[PDB]
């Protein structure tokens, strides 16, 4: 079932082909296939930030779950759902968070409410975990978006004729 | 640990050097250097906005918390967010918070149930503070954003054969 699941989005996506007829639409469909030089960029630069903001972020919560899936959802899924406006400020900002103590090592720990959250996040120098939030939304959220924009636009305004 | 994550971060931003190879890259990574100019305005445009919005938004909440961390987070941070879709009405408008009697002061109060909004805020004159949340939506989220998607558009274009 899984992979005729997968099957069916392609044979979907061949139906693209109909619009390669209309005079207004074909020429699209050809620009769209040379914007693909503009989001390998945008990806590349993405995930670069991702790593980057993602590997930081863990970093100072050392969540104690640390379980080598849910490592990966809180680097690469979670940073990447904030892009578009999902930001668990519960699961990241101490000051929402319930005091408790978890674990025997030194520091002081916050309860996240969120079940993939980590069951118990440090909140040594959690302005700092904030910070890179206000800093990731402006880069990835803001300017990279803007930047991709730009690209498509001039790449759009370039490539019309040909 | 945290000085660490950090620098951790400035490793992998580190790793952008390889696009400067691919000849389709390069010059992309280098039109990025040049958009600083626009950033900086974009920042220094919204950072006025955002502290015309925010300190007159909690002037007018009057919340009895008041203590000075929390007041930079209600007057900069919870903002902020705003502009990415984070908009905690429950924590502004007054018709959607319980009325209770928390300070002899006069006047009526409400009591907000987020953590950090505020043990208690003035109802005096609410809808100036949810006026002004569309004024800032509206200015901010997308006078500004779409203005600098703008300035990116000519920017790129411009330096883009430099």
Redesign the interface.
Known sequence: RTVLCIDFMVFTVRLLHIFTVNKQLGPKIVIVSKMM?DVF?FL??LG?WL???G??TE??L?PRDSDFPSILRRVFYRPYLQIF?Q?P?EDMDV??MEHSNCSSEPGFWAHPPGAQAGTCVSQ??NW?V?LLL?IF?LVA???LV??L???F??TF?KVQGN
Chains 1, 2 share one sequence.
Do not use: D, E
């Open positions: 030089k960029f590349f630069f670069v790593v980057a903001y590997v930081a970093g100072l050392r406006g930001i400020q000051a929402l040594y120098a700092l904030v206000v939304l959220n803001i300017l803007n930047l924009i730009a690209m636009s001039y305004g």
